[PDB]
Design a protein around this motif. Structure first.
Motif, mmCIF file in Angstrom:
data_model
loop_
_atom_site.group_PDB
_atom_site.id
_atom_site.type_symbol
_atom_site.label_atom_id
_atom_site.label_comp_id
_atom_site.label_asym_id
_atom_site.label_seq_id
_atom_site.Cartn_x
_atom_site.Cartn_y
_atom_site.Cartn_z
ATOM 1 N N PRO B 247 -6.770 -6.049 -6.102
ATOM 2 C CA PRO B 247 -5.713 -7.081 -6.174
ATOM 3 C C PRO B 247 -4.843 -7.152 -4.938
ATOM 4 O O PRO B 247 -4.353 -8.235 -4.574
ATOM 5 N N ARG B 248 -4.608 -6.004 -4.317
ATOM 6 C CA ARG B 248 -3.664 -5.873 -3.227
ATOM 7 C C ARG B 248 -4.227 -6.370 -1.903
ATOM 8 O O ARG B 248 -3.487 -6.482 -0.920
ATOM 9 N N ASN B 284 -1.418 -5.414 0.219
ATOM 10 C CA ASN B 284 -0.087 -6.065 0.046
ATOM 11 C C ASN B 284 1.031 -5.012 0.127
ATOM 12 O O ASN B 284 2.079 -5.327 0.725
ATOM 13 N N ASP B 285 0.829 -3.817 -0.444
ATOM 14 C CA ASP B 285 1.935 -2.817 -0.498
ATOM 15 C C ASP B 285 1.835 -1.870 0.698
ATOM 16 O O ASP B 285 0.756 -1.290 0.935
#
Ligand SMILES: *[C@@H]1O[C@H](CO)[C@@H](O)[C@H](O)[C@H]1NC(C)=O
Ligand SMILES: *[C@@H]1O[C@H](CO)[C@@H](O)[C@H](O)[C@H]1NC(C)=O
Lengths: 435, 435
Positions: B247-248, B284-285
């Motif tokens: 997902p990231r 993303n993170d």
């Protein structure tokens, strides 16, 4: 079949400090004399004795003696070799200079007779001027590193003014057991005390970095008598520590210590005595070390930066250190820990660890290498090594040959891969790293 | 001038795991086939492929392939040589077994073509049965040590059941870069997983003990693409970590990762891609690693007991490890720290540190030695070394000769001192420590 060529050092005035010692400059020779040496004879090399101003631990003007040799034909350019004897004794007769003198009678003569001739011959058979110096000094303090280091540097400065040598002359230290300790301290101090002494390198092995760690290993041991000699030497070096000690001597301890400071109680003696004895027994107070001033003197009497109540200095120049891993006399560990400490502060320490060796045996092993090394360092060619390590396995230089290992073909195939793109985008190398 | 002798592994069914895999015993071969190998040809040695049950990281029954060789004339007694290829790739075509196959087309063939022929020749020119194994497996997870270790041990067990070899057959591991990592993990696991595999020794170099430390060194680097390959392999090995990651992926990261898992994106590819890229950019993170489950998977993906959320096991048998000190691709330090950790837990690690070498160059240096060593270990004659060190300077064995150093006389004098009482009450030794 002949006897001592000299008056015992206590009796000889040469050894006595002059009233003009404060006037005399550091590393300046008050006086000198020819001096008969078994080693000096074996090598045709003129041997002398140099009574030279130096400094003691309390930063005081004191005289001291060294034994210098002059090879029949010096190397060009001139090079200086320094050897530190493992006198391991607290008495003046135990002085290396007395030991270098001819005849059966001198007590510390045996330490000079074994490995020392071999070494200082080689150092002369290679045209290096030799100096060995009474590293304990008038104090005769064994294991007192600050005192030992200042004297050795002063002796090289004295050696230099005596033979009008070049200040740039490159010097080469050597030592084992107590000589390693005296060495290890002379380098550590060398930068601070004698900056003008260029050092092409220094080898030394079986080295006790910390007096306190060594004493603990020695105590309650066959070699405990060396710890008593250690305590006595440290006490001679530090007189506030003497003030502490004298009262605390039980009736036994008063005689243990006046025995280990008695005439003729040199290394051979010191080995057979106080075996398995707890040093603490002689002192009235069991802790002894924890009470000041010994605790904080021990804080300064170590080259291990962990304990040191000062910032241990770090010899950059190419060094060579060994130690029997099971060193039954000098603790292997504090040695390692100096070396490691000193390697993260950036030193050039070719460290050799013998896994199956004693204190006594390991002296001989890394004798040849340490000298082989000491040769190279003078030529500026110390094999470039990962600090804390040795040379790693380089075929044909120190491991089997690329052909003996793989055979001719496989070795030729390997010798082709040079210059060719690795599986990583970079040229492959040669099998022999760079020399 | 010829092409691939086989269907690509994705397409070939042999590589596919069977529905009967759970029934099949660990290290049991489901099936096999002859198999054409450039190396196998150069050495007249029959080469085969073994589809054998093994275990993945989640402790699940999976099939896997290995490439075995049978030398024309085996040693007596029989010995097994294991080589781990540094595939450093996340795709099936990148498998070592595909690389061993003939022809220009196979993508990972280059890793087999350089050092590997030289090595597996020698291993066969000495009559050792060879096995190399697709250490990443069907998962093709690079840097996933638990998965890599289980497969290599299973491959040796498979190799053994396939040639009906003696369970006591003494095995000999080898590896560098990613193969060292796969090796280093196969030994660490060997005692727990495959106890019945006697190991006369194991050499390996340029080894990354910790995936997390390696990734940090790789990230924001030319070799950062290897870190992306690392992350992708770890994600294939740990599917809860895949669940995290997918997902990231920003739109870039989705394509970075499906590229590094794409067909034909093998080691040569993986080196030229994602250069200087922050892996963190694709996720993303920014922290990424700190969030579970990667942090604690990284806690298990390390052989450095400092980080390890488990008790790292300690290979006793005589090992041989090297590492370029400036290893521009694999961090020298976590290697040292494994070795040291492992030496206080009591291992037999002849550690060689090259001070002037790269990742690429150092592969060649300690190639000859590592094999020279690997010879001895099979004969039970691994030179006995202080752990964490090498052999120390032993004249005539690996340093100048006692005579070349001192000259003949001084060397004879030294050779007399044997048996004679040192200045410490013990015999002197010989200059050559015990062999
Ligand atoms: C030993 O004697 C000295 C003499 O001053 C004294 O100060 C010291 O405390 C004594 N130690 C013990 C344990 O009695
Ligand atoms: C990235 O996306 C995932 C999707 O579940 C989300 O949970 C995560 O918190 C996101 N990270 C950031 C920094 O927004």
């Amino acid at each position: 079949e002949r006897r001592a060529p000299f008056p015992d050092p206590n009796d000889d005035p040469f050894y006595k400090t002059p009233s003009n010692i404060g006037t005399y400059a550091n590393g300046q020779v008050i006086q000198s004399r020819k001096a008969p040496t078994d080693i000096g004879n074996q090598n045709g090399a003129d041997s002398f004795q140099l009574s030279y101003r130096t400094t003691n631990t309390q930063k005081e003007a004191q005289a001291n003696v060294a034994t210098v040799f002059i090879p029949s034909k010096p190397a060009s350019p001139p090079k200086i070799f320094s050897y530190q004897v493992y006198e391991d004794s607290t008495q003046l007769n135990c002085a290396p200079s007395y030991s270098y003198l001819t005849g059966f009678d001198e007590p510390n003569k045996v330490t000079t007779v074994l490995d020392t001739p071999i070494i200082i011959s080689w150092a002369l058979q290679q045209g290096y001027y030799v100096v060995s110096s009474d590293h304990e000094g008038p104090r005769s303090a064994f294991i007192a590193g600050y005192e030992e280091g200042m004297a050795i540097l002063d002796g090289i400065r004295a050696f230099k003014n005596f033979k009008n040598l070049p200040e740039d002359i490159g010097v080469g230290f050597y030592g084992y057991s107590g000589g390693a300790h005296a060495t290890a301290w002379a380098v550590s101090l060398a930068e601070g005390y004698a900056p003008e002494i260029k050092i092409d390198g220094a080898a030394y092995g079986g080295t006790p970095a910390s007096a306190k760690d060594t004493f603990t290993f020695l105590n309650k041991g066959f070699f405990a008598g060396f710890a008593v000699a250690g305590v006595s030497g440290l006490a001679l070096a530090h007189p506030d520590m003497e003030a502490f000690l004298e009262p605390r001597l039980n009736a036994k301890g008063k005689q243990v210590f006046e025995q280990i400071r008695s005439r003729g109680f040199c290394l051979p003696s010191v080995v057979l005595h106080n075996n398995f004895v707890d040093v603490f027994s002689l002192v009235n107070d069991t802790n002894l070390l924890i009470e000041e001033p010994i605790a904080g003197i021990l804080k300064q009497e170590t080259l291990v930066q962990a304990e040191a109540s000062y910032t241990v200095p770090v010899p950059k120049f190419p060094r060579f250190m060994w130690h029997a891993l099971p060193d039954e006399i000098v603790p292997f560990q504090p040695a390692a820990n100096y070396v490691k400490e000193q390697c993260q502060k950036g030193a050039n320490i070719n460290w050799n660890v013998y896994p199956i060796a004693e204190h006594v045996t390991a002296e001989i092993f890394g004798l040849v290498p340490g000298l082989d090394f000491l040769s190279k360092a003078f030529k500026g060619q110390t094999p470039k090594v990962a600090c804390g390590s040795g040379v790693p396995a380089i075929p044909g230089i120190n491991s089997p040959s690329t052909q003996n290992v793989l055979g001719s073909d496989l070795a030729n195939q390997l010798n082709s891969l040079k210059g060719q793109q690795s599986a990583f985008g970079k040229p492959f190398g040669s099998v022999s790293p760079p020399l």
